[PDB]
């Protein structure tokens, strides 16, 4: 789908989404194409109409460079998004580690970002269930309990786990929280179960 020079092989995410007139059901769009084909004076005339519409798409479709959240190959590519919908993951030749190459996970495995199961509010345990609570109360409780165990049991009674899914800066801040704020060296990431050897 990436290397195909036309729409012959395309991502289902692009179908009916990229264009302004591509949402029109094929039942109505097919006669429109047949009408236009018959009417057509020249290719350059209707190519100009198509170019103006192509230019307009820049209002809707947002193309953003990202680095794959999955494995260590480090594939970078552009995400084409109309609102919150991912239309297609468009690889670029300039991508230093992968070029135009992708696997099913980086090319098509991004549904989780829009999953209805995505956590959108902090949860504070209230007995046998989780209570949806404001960010302030969740942060205030973490500060109150972390300070409580640090005073009564010491800074070394608090461990911190960094995610190798998260960024370099997020790893740096987790260890700066553990060492510079809490005062412990209890930091680690999934590399422990992985390439520590």
């Amino acid at each position: 789908s990436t290397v195909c020079p036309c729409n012959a092989m395309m991502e289902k995410g692009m179908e009916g989404e990229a264009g302004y007139l591509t949402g029109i059901n094929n039942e109505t769009l097919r006669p429109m194409i047949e009408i236009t084909k018959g009417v057509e004076t020249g290719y350059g005339s209707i190519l100009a109409i198509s170019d103006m519409e192509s230019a307009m798409r820049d209002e809707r479709i947002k193309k953003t460079k990202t680095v794959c959240t999955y494995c260590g190959v480090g594939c970078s590519f552009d995400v084409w998004t109309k609102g919150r919908d991912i239309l297609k993951v468009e690889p670029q030749e300039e991508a230093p580690a992968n070029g135009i190459s992708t696997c099913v996970k980086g090319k098509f495995g991004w549904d989780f970002v829009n999953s209805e199961e995505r956590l959108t509010k902090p949860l504070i345990r209230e007995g046998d269930h989780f209570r949806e609570a404001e960010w302030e109360e969740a942060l205030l409780l973490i500060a109150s309990k972390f300070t409580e165990l640090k005073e009564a049991f010491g800074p070394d009674s608090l461990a911190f786990i960094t995610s190798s899914k998260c960024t370099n800066e997020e790893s740096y801040l987790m260890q700066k929280l553990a060492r510079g704020v809490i005062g412990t060296n209890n930091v680690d990431n999934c590399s422990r179960y992985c390439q520590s050897p």
Partner: protein
């Protein structure tokens, strides 16, 4: 009583007049409530259909 001509007018403050003017516009919307409601429904369909996004993009780009 004796003849007098001088009239001390009642103070219509800037904020008081602003409320009067806004309330006059509110009353006009209330009177044309059905027409506004119908315009909004029509506008909502222009957005559902290709129309409003197409115009937003035509002027945007």
């Amino acid at each position: 009583a004796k003849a007098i001509k001088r009239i001390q007018k009642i103070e219509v403050t800037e904020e008081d007049q602003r409320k009067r003017d806004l309330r006059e516009i509110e009353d006009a919307l209330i009177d044309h409530k059905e027409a506004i409601l119908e315009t909004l429904h029509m506008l909502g369909h222009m957005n559902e259909r290709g129309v409003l996004p197409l115009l937003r993009g035509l002027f945007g780009q």
